[PDB]
Design an enzyme around this catalytic site. Structure first.
Site, PDB file in Angstrom:
ATOM      1  N   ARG A   1      -0.972  17.405  10.919  1.00  0.00           N
ATOM      2  CA  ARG A   1       0.361  17.105  11.455  1.00  0.00           C
ATOM      3  C   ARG A   1       0.741  18.004  12.626  1.00  0.00           C
ATOM      4  NH1 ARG A   1       2.105  15.420   5.416  1.00  0.00           N
ATOM      5  NH2 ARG A   1       3.813  13.959   5.887  1.00  0.00           N
TER       6      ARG A   1
ATOM      7  N   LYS B   1       2.366  -2.204  -9.275  1.00  0.00           N
ATOM      8  CA  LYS B   1       3.627  -2.867  -9.596  1.00  0.00           C
ATOM      9  C   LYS B   1       4.052  -3.848  -8.521  1.00  0.00           C
ATOM     10  CE  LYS B   1       6.230   0.529  -9.982  1.00  0.00           C
ATOM     11  NZ  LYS B   1       5.757   1.639  -9.115  1.00  0.00           N
TER      12      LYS B   1
ATOM     13  N   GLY C   1       0.528   5.113   1.702  1.00  0.00           N
ATOM     14  CA  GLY C   1      -0.097   6.407   1.446  1.00  0.00           C
ATOM     15  C   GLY C   1      -1.466   6.287   0.810  1.00  0.00           C
TER      16      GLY C   1
END
Lengths: 417, 416
Positions: B40, B216, B374
């Site tokens: 990052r 899910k 992710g």
């Protein structure tokens, strides 16, 4: 596709005798030095707990969370004190366990008094509840897929029947919200009431339906406005939001009024849409202005045509605007109110919001269904002590907002029909 | 439509001698003062170097780390990042343990010409998020006067604002919306994110495919709904699939994951997909195991041959994986968010992996491919194929919001 009304509640349960009942509650209470500042959230569970006792439930098991402990045991967020407050409210000894799942927990339930109340430890001490967390170092960690499933099964076998009485978290697809795979899954009295009223406002509502919106930012509230525009007949937009709309639509001078740079980019399509969806939009036509952001500053009234001078700022809707509320509010049959109409924390700019409340209270007496969601607006209602004059004041904060944005609530969908 | 019209660092003609405030994402993994992943930080270098090469007077950096919730917390200090920054620039980098007020302004003005300055965690101030937490763990709202002040104090730091923290742009925080300078532009990371999502969500070359997966369906419903208004084709796999299959086809699923919440919505989604002429590709066969463990026994079953009781679906079968070929290789834009099975269990990762190979292959053919989530990002990382995809998104949060059809205040607040 109406998922708010058709759901089974505790009230419709017949076969509860001798069963063990797991109940998801909201115990997210303020606390200083071990003593609980506000009891309302604990107090609200009483009707659910009491009904389960009367109907002859074997054991009542309470699961909840406190704050954001992020998957680790944190002393600040222990909900042991809530068992101490609950002790007084029930008139019984209340068993508190250091964990919410596992071997010692499973036995200690089955050993306690028949018809007794057990409160388990903060659910969010386990990474698997939210599905993600933080470790000792402050670094983000994700829970394992097999661990989450196991944790859900661990919770599932604790009881025979599941009661969700935590609407405020129904917007999260967390283990305690969607993972309790019992046959019988029903809303508690708190959840039921929340579902009933939002069902009335959002599903086949009695019309005209009015949304009253306010607050400081527009950008915080895009999806709220856009979605409500598909549902309502009428919309008031006030508070700090109004100056953004007035600058874009009218090129009004706003002096040092709060201007939302981000939200202003959406004003166009919000208005093109209000037209397309047949919604009447009402914006303030005058303003109470102050020479400094202070209750004791010099103040003045200006119409939208006049505009606001330089270094002055608008902090409340003016008298003409307050008068415009009458026909809008008193002529609706359902009102949803989420947002103050001015800086009401300061007495000299509270009038706009106060008179708006008076009007919502008056129309409730006429027969209209009136809902307050959101914290700020709820603070106004509490301060005036008018909670019981409103059809429904929503406890849920994140969830109510998310439901108004058109999102389906996983915790609600995971109930039986 | 609001992604493709934004001002970037490339188009600024007058950076020379200007004080430049840069919002960056420095939310990095750390242990004992030692940074674990510098990715990052090195990502901000093209932005920093351009600012340097162009003649900026000062380069002031602001960022956050974790969730200190308005409290000063030693666990989330940004001091170690300045240490790392020194090694990447070859240059001493000033670090201030505050970010607002006159003491801060003076030290910025005092510092070397053309120098970089890193300020402390934005989130030590409750005014950044507008909400916070006290030493008791009780939620506290920030005072509205203080929020406005904090925003003005940030604005007073510089003459030009650069936003490079796409991953925070979904939140109306002070550093995203309150820097009221005249010139507000993308950094190179933000530019790249906007360029790519703009292409996919505003003006895509078609067929546009969505590849969706996860355990899910409960949390993906707005993702699916919105994406139905966007795409021509959709693959749905990795666990979600078993809920769809049981509800729609009446297929026996044994002890595989079943979303009790999502099940209520599955019928609605298929109605909308059909009505909007969106083709749905659901697994036609499955890899099944007798335990949620890598070492278990495994076989394959069809649509019609259901999953036997006490067996578990953990990956799409060979016929389903073959079906991906026609769907993926004939697309011209692909948005991918979600693995197609439990991908970090070697046995049953195959489906997720072959799907990556197909996405990589279509990118070579000329398609624009975006990975967002992710877990999908992880798969691309462990296989080391980051450079083989058009764009792998940083956001997660911001990319999800954008895919769900929401606006990003941090983007909206940029100049056109």
């Amino acid at each position: 596709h109406h998922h708010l009304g058709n759901k089974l509640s505790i009230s419709d349960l017949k076969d509860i005798k001798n069963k063990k009942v797991l109940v998801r509650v909201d115990f997210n209470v303020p606390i200083e030095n071990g003593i609980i500042k506000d009891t309302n959230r604990i107090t609200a569970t009483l009707p659910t707990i009491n009904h389960l006792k009367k109907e002859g439930a074997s054991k009542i098991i309470l699961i909840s969370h406190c704050g954001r402990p992020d998957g680790l045991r944190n002393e600040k967020y222990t909900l042991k004190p809530v068992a101490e407050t609950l002790k007084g409210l029930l008139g019984e000894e209340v068993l508190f366990l250091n964990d919410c799942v596992g071997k010692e927990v499973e036995d200690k339930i089955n050993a306690a008094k028949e018809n007794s109340v057990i409160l388990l430890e903060n659910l969010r001490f386990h990474i698997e509840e939210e599905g993600k967390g933080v470790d000792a170092n402050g670094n983000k960690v994700k829970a394992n897929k097999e661990d989450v499933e196991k944790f859900q099964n661990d919770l599932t076998k604790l009881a025979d029947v599941f009661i969700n009485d935590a609407f405020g978290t129904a917007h999260r697809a967390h283990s305690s919200m969607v993972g309790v795979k019992l046959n019988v899954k029903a809303s508690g009295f708190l959840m039921k009431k929340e579902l009933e009223y939002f069902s009335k406002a959002l599903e086949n509502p009695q019309r005209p339906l009015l949304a009253i919106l306010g607050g400081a930012k527009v950008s915080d509230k895009i999806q709220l406005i856009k979605n409500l525009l598909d549902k309502v007949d009428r919309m008031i937009i006030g508070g700090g939001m109004a100056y953004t709309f007035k600058k874009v639509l009218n090129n009004m001078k706003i002096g040092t009024s709060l201007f939302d740079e981000a939200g202003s980019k959406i004003v166009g399509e919000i208005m093109e849409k209000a037209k397309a969806k047949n919604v009447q939009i009402f914006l303030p036509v005058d303003f109470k202005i102050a020479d400094n952001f202070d209750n004791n500053a010099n103040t003045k009234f200006v119409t939208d045509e006049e505009g606001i001078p330089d270094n002055w700022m608008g902090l409340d809707a003016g008298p003409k605007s307050i008068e415009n509320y009458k026909d809008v509010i008193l002529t609706s049959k359902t009102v949803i109110w989420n947002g103050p109409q001015g800086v009401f924390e300061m007495p000299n700019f509270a009038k706009g919001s106060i008179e708006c409340l008076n009007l919502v209270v008056e129309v409730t007496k006429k027969g209209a269904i009136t809902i307050v969601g959101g914290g700020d607006t709820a603070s106004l209602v509490e301060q005036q002590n008018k909670k019981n004059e409103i059809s429904h004041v929503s406890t849920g904060g994140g969830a109510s907002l998310e439901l108004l944005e058109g999102k389906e609530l996983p915790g609600v969908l995971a109930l039986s029909n």
